[PDB]
Amino acid sequence: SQYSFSLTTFSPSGKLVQIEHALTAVGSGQTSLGIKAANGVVIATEKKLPSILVDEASVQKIQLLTPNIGVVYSGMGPDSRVLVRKSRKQAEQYYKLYKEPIPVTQLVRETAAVMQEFTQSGGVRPFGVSLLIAGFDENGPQLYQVDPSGSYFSWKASAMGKNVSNAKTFLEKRYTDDMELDDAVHTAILTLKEGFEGQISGKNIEIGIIGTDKKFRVLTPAEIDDYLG
């Protein structure tokens, strides 16, 4: 079991090609986006299923890692589960050692290092996923993005997946500071509606929001419909 030969080498131009293929692979994933209100954060994604026979309630794309933090993925579904599991494990290690919730930034950094591992280690491909980690903690609301290259950033608002550019420009023109959490929720729902072929419904999209100092909660269809109504 040698399996010790980086399959992601440096192309003659200095570019790490396989990571670029991973970025395209997320580029063909369903859209997702996130905004940070001045007093909270919001993340949402489109959850359109190939058939009615698929029970939409049996899986959620927005998942919370710690009661402060939740994540959304774009690209390959199976990889996001790997990353969510590992991030939960690291959060619980931090809590074991220090009896405090892990700060959003630290969780993001550790997940990013996990991402990076697969871009240097031999015998594996980088994760075909990018993550939007929304959290609210002692030093304010935060929205972080993570990409298969393992680099992470802090965004005021962002999107990724199918229909990145249109959602991105929409947010850029429509975003503003001092935006309330509910304004952010409406804005996110509108941005999804922009490119969402078909008609939105509580069973088509997924929303998660963190209030002030409160817990990350994933809106149920019964109330997302109230928001969009």
| Residues in touch with other proteins (CB under 8 A) | 2-16, 36, 96-100, 103, 105-106, 109, 112-113, 115-116, 119-122, 143, 149-151, 153-158, 168, 171-172, 175
- Least CB distance to other proteins at residue 55 (A): 36
Rg of the chain, C-alpha, whole Å: 18
Task: Establish how many alpha carbons lie within 13 A of residue 134's alpha carbon, considering only the half-sphere containing its beta carbon.
Answer: 37
- Do 64 and 209 form a contact (C-beta atoms < 8 A)? no
What are the Cα distances from residue 26, in Å, to 35, 41, 71, 199, 212? 20, 23, 15, 24, 31
- Least CB distance to other proteins at residue 150 (A): 4
- Least CB distance to other proteins at residue 157 (A): 5
- Least CB distance to other proteins at residue 207 (A): 20
Q: Which is nearer to other proteins, 175 or 196 (CB)?
A: 175
Q: Which of 104, 171, 173 has its CA nearest to residue 135?
A: 104
Q: Which is nearer to other proteins, 168 or 203 (CB)?
A: 168
Residue 210 CB-density burial (10 A; 0-12 exposed, 13-18 middle, 19+ buried): buried
Q: Which is nearer to other proteins, 212 or 220 (CB)?
A: 212
Q: Which is nearer to other proteins, 64 or 157 (CB)?
A: 157
